[PDB]
Amino acid sequence: NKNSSYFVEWIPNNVKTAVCDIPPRGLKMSATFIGNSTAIQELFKRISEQFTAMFRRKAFLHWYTGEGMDEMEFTEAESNMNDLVSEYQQYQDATADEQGEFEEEGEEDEA
Amino acid sequence: HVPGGGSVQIVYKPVDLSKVTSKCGSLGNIHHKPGGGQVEVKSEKLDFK
Q1: Which residue on chain A is closest to B10 by alpha carbon?
Q2: Which CATH entry fits the domain spanning A40-94: 1.10.287.600, 2.30.40.10, 1.10.287.90, 3.30.300.30?
Q3: How many residue contacts between A and B have a Cβ separation below 8 Å?
Q4: Dist. CA B30–CA A74, nearest whole Å
Q5: Of A76, A82, A99, which to mutate for an interface test with B (greatest number of B Cβ within 10 Å)?
Q6: What share of chain B is helix, strand, coil (3-state, %, to 5)?
Q7: Torsion of CA A69, A70, A73, A78, to 10 degrees
Q8: C-alpha dihedral (A55, A59, A62, A67), degrees to nearest 10
Q9: Are A94 and A10 in contact (CB under 8 A)?
Q10: Residue of A28, A60, A75, B5 with fewest CB within 10 Å of its CB?
């Protein structure tokens, strides 16, 4: 309620509760958080630019090709991480309002 | 070199409803039979020849 801006709007009521009777040894009570946010875009955003910083210049790469890997694979790992950061950014702040194909049928015309 | 990927497209099918019949009982019957016919029962024949 006080943090409506921090939830995605087309998954309703974004919480999984669960309660155990038994606390961790040496704590009278505790809770565990597992949160799934768009915010993780940040990880894949930083790592895929640092990765293009490397493979764009074949830097550090002779050590790995030198074990039987190929340049196609660096491209496919990259292709996918860039695709992946584009999927998390597609859903970063994605509407509960309809998405796309906004075209229509007209009015009847004199003959 | 062209650097890899960077392209997805949304997993999205818009929602609608089709052939949802308005089958409520609100006008569910029309049949009728009258509460009997009109008759006379109050009068004698007085048939004294």
Answers
A1: A90
A2: 1.10.287.600
A3: 41
A4: 76
A5: A82
A6: 5, 0, 95
A7: 110
A8: -60
A9: yes
A10: A28
